[PDB]
Design a protein around this ligand. Structure first.
Ligand code: CA
Ligand code: CA
Lengths: 256, 256
C-alpha cells in the first residue's frame, strides 16, 4: 500500500522553439530523485525538440494525445507507433479539454488508452466532472462512468491496469485558479480506490497511482499531498514556470 | 488567366523518423523548378525532422491541420503561432478525413482557414462530396456550401483569398484507387470557377489555383493535368513513393 509518487506537467498549447529548449534545460538541470516519477508533456510539434534538450536520466517526455488507429489514412492525427519510434513511453489520454470542448467520448478515450497500453505505454488517464454535474450531485457517477468505459475495453486482462496512472481533474478547477480543497479531492480519490477494489482487484487498488489536477501549484500542493489517496499531481499552467521544480522538491519530501 | 501550377504531398498518419529523413532527402535532391510550387505535409511530430532534412531552396513544408484559437489551454492542439515560429507558411485545412470522420464542421474549417490567412499563411482548403451525395445529385451544392462558409468568414476582405489554394477531393476517391475521370473533375472545377467569379471577383477567378486530389498518381495524372481548370494535384499515398518526383516532372512539362 506503499505507492511511488508521480508528477506530470502538461504544457498544453503553449511554447516556442526557444522556450522549449530553455525550459526543458532548466528542469533537466534540477535534481530529480529516482524515487519519484517526473513527466512533462510538450505540444506535438515540439516533442523532438524537447527530447534533444532533455539531458536528464530521470525526466520523461509524454505526448498530450494520440489517435485510436495505427498508421494509415488519418490526416492530422498521431499514432502510438509514431510515439514509440521516437522513444516515448508516456501519453495523456482523455484530458477534459478534449472530452468537453472537442467532443471526445468516453468510449473513444477508453479505446485510445487500451491500444497504448497493449503496446507497452504508460497512460495518464484523465477523469472529471463539470460544475453543473457537481451541483446536480452527480460527481461520483460521472467519474466512475468515465473509468468503467476503460474497464470495459480492458476486459479480464487486468494486467494492463498496471501501467495506468489515474488523474482526477475537476473541470471547474481547470485553468481557473479555483483549486479543490483537500477534503473535496480526497473524497473523490477515496471513491475511486473503492471502485477499483470492487471492479478490478483489492491488491491492485493498493498500488495504482491516482493524481490530482486543476490549479495545482507550488503554494497549494503541499497540503493536498498530505491526503493519503493523492499520489501526486498533474500540473498545467504552473508546469511552464520555475515553481514546477519546487513542486518536485516538495513531493519528494512529503511522500518518500 | 495564366496560373502557376501547384503540387502538394500529404503523408497522412504514416512515417518513422528514419523514413522521413530518407524520403525528404530524396525529394530535396530532385530538380524542382522555380516555376512550380511543391509542398509536402508530414505528420505533426515529424515537422522538425523534415525541416532539418530539407536541403532544397524550392521545397516547402506544410502542417496537416491546425486549431482555431491562439496559444492557451487547448491540450492536444497546434496553433498558427507555433507553425510560424518553426518557419512554416503552409497548412492544410478541412481535409475530408477530418470533416467526415472526426466531425469537423463547415464553419470550423472556415474559421481555421481565416485565422491562418490573416496571419499571412498559405491555406490548402479542401472540399468534396460523398458517394451518397453524388448519387442524390448534390455534388455542386455540397462543394459550394463548404466554400461559402469560408466566404462568410472572410467577408468583404477578398484580399485574403489571394493565399488560398482550393483542393477538390471527391470523398469516394480518397484512398480507394478509384480516380475521377477528367470529365468528372473538370466539371466540378468549372463549377467552382464560376462560383468564385460570381461571389468573389472575375479577375480573382482567373488567378486562384484549384487542384485535384483522390487517387492521383504518376500513371493517371498527365491526362488530368491537361484539363484547363485543374492547376495541379494534392497527392496522398503516392507522395510517400518515388513517383511523387515523376509527378513533379510531368506537371512542369504539362502546365509551364
Ligand atoms: Ca492539466
Ligand atoms: Ca490527400
Amino acid at each position: 500500500p506503499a505507492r511511488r509518487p508521480f508528477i506530470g506537467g502538461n504544457f498544453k498549447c503553449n511554447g516556442s522553439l526557444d522556450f522549449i529548449k530553455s525550459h526543458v534545460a532548466a528542469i533537466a538541470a534540477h535534481k530529480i530523485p529516482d524515487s519519484v516519477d517526473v513527466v512533462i508533456a510538450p505540444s506535438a510539434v515540439h516533442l523532438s525538440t524537447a527530447i534533444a534538450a532533455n539531458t536528464s536520466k530521470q525526466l520523461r517526455i509524454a505526448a498530450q494525445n494520440v489517435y485510436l488507429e495505427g498508421n494509415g489514412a488519418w490526416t492530422g492525427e498521431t499514432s502510438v507507433e509514431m510515439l514509440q519510434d521516437m522513444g516515448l513511453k508516456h501519453v495523456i489520454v482523455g484530458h477534459s479539454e478534449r472530452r468537453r470542448i472537442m467532443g471526445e467520448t468516453d468510449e473513444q478515450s477508453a479505446k485510445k488508452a487500451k491500444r497504448a497500453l497493449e503496446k507497452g505505454m504508460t497512460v495518464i488517464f484523465c477523469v472529471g466532472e463539470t460544475l453543473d454535474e457537481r451541483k446536480a450531485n452527480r460527481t461520483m457517477e460521472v467519474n466512475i462512468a468515465q473509468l468503467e468505459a476503460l474497464g470495459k475495453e480492458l476486459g479480464e486482462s487486468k494486467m494492463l491496469w498496471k501501467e495506468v496512472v489515474i488523474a482526477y481533474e475537476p473541470v471547474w478547477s481547470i485553468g481557473t485558479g479555483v483549486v479543490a480543497t483537500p477534503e473535496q479531492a480526497e473524497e473523490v480519490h477515496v471513491g475511486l480506490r473503492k471502485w477499483f477494489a470492487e471492479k478490478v482487484a483489492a491488491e491492485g487498488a493498493q498500488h495504482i497511482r491516482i493524481i490530482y489536477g486543476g490549479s495545482a501549484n507550488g503554494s497549494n500542493c503541499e497540503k493536498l499531498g498530505q491526503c493519503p489517496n493523492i499520489d501526486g499531481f498533474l500540473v498545467g499552467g504552473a508546469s511552464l514556470k520555475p515553481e514546477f521544480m519546487t513542486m518536485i522538491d516538495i513531493l519528494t519530501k512529503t511522500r518518500t
